With several copies, the nearest count.
Chain A
Amino acid sequence: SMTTRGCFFTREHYMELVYRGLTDKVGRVKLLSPSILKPFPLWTGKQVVSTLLINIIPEDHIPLNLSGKAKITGKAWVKETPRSVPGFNPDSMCESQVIIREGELLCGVLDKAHYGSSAYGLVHCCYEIYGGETSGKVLTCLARLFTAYLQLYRGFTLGVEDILVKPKADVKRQRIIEESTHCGPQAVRAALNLPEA
């Protein structure tokens, strides 16, 4: 939800979330610039994770690059029917690819594929580059960030509005259940090799 493209934080929300992700960081918190500078200083959900990474990677060590692929595909963000523009591969600009550059997220959504138990992700690359304690701090700080985004700004729930079926596609279901009562004899004659007579 946070590292999706649509999030936009103002300055005080960003500086609360970054310090919720941290706790007794010994040094100055090395903040970022706004992603949108005018009309309003709007940060992004990706820059909060990026600020957190640049602050938890140690002081002398330069941040890491990464690329790859996430768990949500490209067929999951589609809502309309896609039109094929002539000279554009949609995976060039897609949210499938987590394209962290210099420790900063520049594309992609973080999933189980990058900070879960799933291999070859962000917290595994931070294990096979920086070591153990930094890769423990990445899990700890990304836990504290991702909870204190749900306490404070956007709480997460499970209604009944999110399991329902639209009434136009619910008629297209009661007409296939009605066809499914006539499936009987035609599957037995093909099971016993009997003719139609």
Chain B
Amino acid sequence: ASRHGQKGILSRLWPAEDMPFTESGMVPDILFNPHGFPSRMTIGMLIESMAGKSAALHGLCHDATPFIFSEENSALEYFGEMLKAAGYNFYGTERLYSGISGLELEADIFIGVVYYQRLRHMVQVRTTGARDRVTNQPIGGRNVQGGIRFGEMERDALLAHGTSFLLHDRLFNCSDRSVAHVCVK
């Protein structure tokens, strides 16, 4: 997560030579989507990006206290000039190249320094497992070596498909199939 409440699960660790290196020689560190922004409206993440870039380029430490910037002295026109004096672009963009091809991307990418956090939220295969002594289907029961429940609504949806035999498989052939002896009389 960042500090503007925008969680992102780690999807893929992309190798460094494939990362789009900038014009200054920097690869990025975390790639973030532009498609978390228009529905969630975290303008504070963009100003934090421009401000962390303009603070690491100057040695400064920047005040991000709420209600200190008005509309007559904007938060994007302040750190914009802080990036204009530092040589970079007034809008926080830097001309990234590519790493998978070799040539320049045609729209200049918004890059900056954003303080990420790591959440405590940390990150089941069954074959010939142990059955229970009553109703000898696989056990389950909030522990190890337990099978996967099919379920009432899965019975429902799989009858709605029309596949009677996958239901026969997953509901009779793979759990507690037994041979029984009856006198036909």
Contact = CB atoms under 8 A, between A and B. Distances in A.
A and B touch in the complex (CB under 8 A): yes
Interface in A147-172: 151-161, 163-164
The number of chain B residues touching the other chain, given as a range, is 20 to 34
Contacts, number: 48
- Specify the main secondary structure of chain A where it touches its partner: loop
Interface of A: 151-161, 163-164
B92 A159 contact: yes
6 contacts: A153-B103, A155-B106, A158-B34, A159-B93, A159-B108, A160-B92
Interface string B35-79: 001000001001000100000000000000000000000001000
A155 B76 contact: no
A153 B101 contact: yes
B30 to A, nearest CB: 14
Interface of B: 20, 34, 37, 43, 46, 50, 76, 80, 91-93, 96, 98, 100-101, 103, 105-110
Contacts of A155: 20, 96, 98, 105-107, 109
B107 A157 contact: yes
Contacts of B106: 153-155
Contact of A161 (B43, B91, B105): B91
Contact of B91 (A152, A154, A160): A160
B110 A157 contact: yes
B101 A158 contact: no
